[PDB]
C-alpha cells in the first residue's frame, strides 16, 4: 500500500 503514496 505504501507504494501508492510517497
Amino acid at each position: 500500500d505504501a507504494e501508492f503514496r510517497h
Partner: antibody
Amino acid sequence: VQLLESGGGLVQPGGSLRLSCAASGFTFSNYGMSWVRQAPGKGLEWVASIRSGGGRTYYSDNVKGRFTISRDNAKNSLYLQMNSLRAEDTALYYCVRYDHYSGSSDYWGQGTLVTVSS
Amino acid sequence: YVVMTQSPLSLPVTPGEPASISCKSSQSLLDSDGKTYLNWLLQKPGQSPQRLIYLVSKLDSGVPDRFSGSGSGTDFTLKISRVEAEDVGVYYCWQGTHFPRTFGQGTKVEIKR
C-alpha cells in the same frame, strides 16, 4: 464494484502464464491496483502493484525480473504476465484495488488459481 | 522487512462474548505524514477477503460497530464486543506504512456453540 480474474491454470516449471482482471463498477483509471497471492492453506503475500499515473510498477523480491504487471485503462483491465514460473508460485492470485481516499487497499477479486507442476 | 505478528493464531469464543486479536509490527507504523496505516480484513469460509478497518480504528462500509480497532506504534488490537456466528473466519492485519506491504499470519476465529 467487481474485480474478475481469469487466466489461472496448470503450467510446467519454467513455463509462462498471463493473468487478467476485468474491473467494473468504478472509474478504473483513477485507482492504483495490485496482485496479491494466497498459497492454499496459507497466508497473504503481496505480489505486484501499479499506480494510476505513469505506468509506475512495484514488485515483491520473489518475482523481480519474472513477473510484469500492466494495465489497459481502455479495457478496464489489469494484467500479470508471469515467466519462469516455479512450484513456489503456486497460489490463488487476487486482483486488489487501492483506495487512496482511505490510504488502504479495499476490494478483492475472487482470485484465479495458478498451479505450477509437471 | 516489517514483520506482522498476530496472536492468538486460533481464537475460540462463546457467542455473545467479546474477542480480542493482537497485531504487532517489528517497526513503528507511524508514517512521516503523521498517519498510522494499520488495517484489518476478514476472510470468511469460501469467500474473498473483505476489509473491516483502516487507519487503526476507522470502520469500513457496512461493518457493524461491534468491531473496533485501537493501538499505535507497533502495538494494535481488533476487538469484537459481542461475537456473532457470522464473525467466523480468518482475520488478517496488514500495514500500509512501509514498502513492501506485509500481512499478519491470520487468526482463525471459532464459534463455541
